[PDB]
Design a protein around this ligand. Structure first.
Ligand SMILES: Cc1cccc(O)c1NC(=O)c1ccncc1F
Lengths: 156, 39
């Protein structure tokens, strides 16, 4: 299958036609996406199979073919870009200044951008083009709008 | 049966559309990976 580094759509043919259920990142031969997109199922790339290697429901992350490789972190000061890959639409960079989720275990950056659910897994990048996390696990606030955490894994 | 399709390179775009606010929210994360607002 295709193993070139980049952003990919995650599709299924189980529902009507071909439906985009999410997005992911190929980096260093490992495919990275959010757990809720695939539920840990195996994936196809052409005639090749990608098997899950690591996953965690609470972090809402999963890696295929190898361990989680993404280790860049939001600096807490600068604007970032969401590389949004919406269903049926071209990949588009959106620049924004993250807010913050404050939790009992520490603070996390958060992005207040609204997209269809099949956009989950789209990467958030810093100014060097490094992936600082994935978009698609978050909350609905007072006005009905969406705010996603910047979810990042740990590179062992 | 799920499959993947390439959609692009991962690169920063100079002069991309700039939008979105920067809210500071108190949140909780449960064992099922769901975030909730704490008030
Ligand atoms: C629920 C979800 C999971 C993952 C990615 C998504 O991108 C969304 N939804 C929205 O952004 C969204 C837009 C507008 N109004 C509410 C919303 F939740």
């Amino acid at each position: 299958g295709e193993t070139t580094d980049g952003v990919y759509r995650v599709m299924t043919r189980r529902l009507l036609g071909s439906t985009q259920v999410g997005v992911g990142v190929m980096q260093e031969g490992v495919f990275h996406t959010m757990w809720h997109v695939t539920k840990g199922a195996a994936l196809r790339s052409g005639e090749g199979r990608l098997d899950p290697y690591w996953g965690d429901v609470k972090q809402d992350l999963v890696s295929y073919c190898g361990p989680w490789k993404l280790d860049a972190a939001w600096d807490g000061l600068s604007e970032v870009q969401l590389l949004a890959v919406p269903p049926g639409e071209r990949a588009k960079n959106i620049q924004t200044l993250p807010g913050i989720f404050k939790t009992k275990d520490g603070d996390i950056g958060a992005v207040a951008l609204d997209y269809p659910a099949g956009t989950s897994g789209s990467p958030i990048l810093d100014k060097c083009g490094r992936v600082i996390g994935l978009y698609g696990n978050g909350v609905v606030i007072k006005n009905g709008s969406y705010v996603s955490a910047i979810t990042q894994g740990k590179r062992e | 049966d799920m499959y993947i399709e390439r959609a692009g390179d991962i690169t920063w775009e100079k002069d991309a559309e700039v939008t979105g606010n920067s809210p500071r929210l108190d949140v909780a994360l449960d064992e099922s990976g769901d975030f909730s607002l704490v008030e």
